[PDB]
Design a protein around this ligand. Structure first.
Ligand SMILES: O=P(O)(O)OP(=O)(O)OCc1cccnc1
Ligand code: SF4
Length: 309
């Protein structure tokens, strides 16, 4: 059995920054450090940080007075940010710059009381945060997940309309939603393409190349990771068996019995150690040295705020 690694894979710049923010705050201020939502959607990272004294919470009322609070990489609504601001709390924001950029566009629309449509998945924290930057009752802020959702949407003034996307969507499915938005609302304004981040686009392109060669693909990432789910879904749609796994333990031997070529990737929130352990497990089940595919080079880094160095 040949083992191939997708390239790129694993940590992006927003995730490296956000985890560093929590680590550094723990180092500087000691436990506990409070964090709104899992800092990133990875059980191993979160379990780790919890064992070192991070406490993960969904509401600001769960955080005591005088504390340090960090917002997760997925971002937060204005109501949450203002709720935290009114309190004695010390707040650090681990929201990814690429999320923040979308937030600002939503807030601009809100100020203009002009309506905005977000493409994303209901209930995901990034979606809550992004919808959560719009407040003007005279405009509106609508969520669509599919072309059918677009086909049934009505808005108050379709002459003044803009769209935004979640950063971790399917590139291809999103393309279909946007095509529908433009057929329905010819005057709609957005970005050139979408708000899907470089890391999501690149990992999707890499798993496409991986799945052209592999019979079976293993995506390292947690169940509640949107971007990781998209990598598995992509592979499956190409006719390959794909499995989303937290770690090497989850590999069932039947999945790779008599498979000549197995591919491994990782979502943007999955640490490289988990991939290394996956490869070691595949080698036990009879695989050779892991071969990295040629891939697009990523060079973007996001620094921690200076107060957390
Ligand atoms: O569920 P997803 O959003 O894929 O979060 P995860 O933490 O798996 O990946 C990092 C991230 C954070 C913020 C925005 N987009 C991606
Ligand atoms: S996957 Fe994208 S938007 Fe999300 S933390 Fe990473 S770089 Fe930022």
């Amino acid at each position: 059995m040949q083992i191939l690694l997708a390239n790129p894979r694993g940590f992006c710049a927003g995730v490296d920054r956000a985890i560093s923010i929590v680590e550094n705050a723990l180092a500087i201020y000691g436990a506990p450090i409070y964090v709104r939502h899992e800092v990133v959607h990875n059980r191993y990272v979160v379990d780790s940080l919890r064992e070192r004294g991070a406490i993960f919470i969904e509401q600001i009322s769960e955080v005591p007075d005088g504390a340090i609070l960090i917002f997760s990489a997925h971002g937060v609504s204005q109501a949450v940010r203002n709720e935290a601001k009114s309190r004695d709390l010390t707040v650090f924001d681990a929201t990814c710059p690429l999320v923040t950029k979308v937030h600002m566009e939503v807030a601009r629309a809100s100020r203009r009381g002009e309506e905005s449509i977000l493409i994303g998945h209901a209930g995901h924290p990034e979606v809550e945060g992004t919808m959560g930057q719009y407040s003007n009752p005279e405009g509106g802020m609508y969520l669509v997940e599919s072309p059918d959702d677009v086909w049934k949407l009505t808005v108050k003034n379709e002459e003044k309309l803009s769209f935004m996307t979640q950063t971790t969507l399917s590139v291809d499915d999103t393309s279909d939603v946007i095509d529908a938005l433009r057929k329905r609302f010819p005057k709609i304004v957005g970005p050139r393409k979408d708000d899907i981040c470089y890391a999501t686009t690149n990992r999707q392109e890499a798993v496409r190349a991986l799945a052209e060669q592999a019979e079976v693909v293993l995506v390292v990432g947690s169940k509640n990771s949107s971007n990781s789910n998209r990598l598995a879904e992509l592979a499956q749609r190409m006719g390959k068996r794909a499995f989303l796994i937290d770690d090497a333990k989850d590999i069932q031997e039947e999945w790779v019995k008599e498979v000549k070529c197995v591919g491994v990737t990782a979502g943007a929130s999955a640490p490289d150690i988990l991939v290394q352990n996956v490869v070691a497990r595949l080698q036990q089940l009879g695989g050779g040295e892991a071969i990295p595919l040629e891939g697009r080079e990523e060079n973007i880094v996001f620094e921690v705020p200076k107060e957390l160095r």
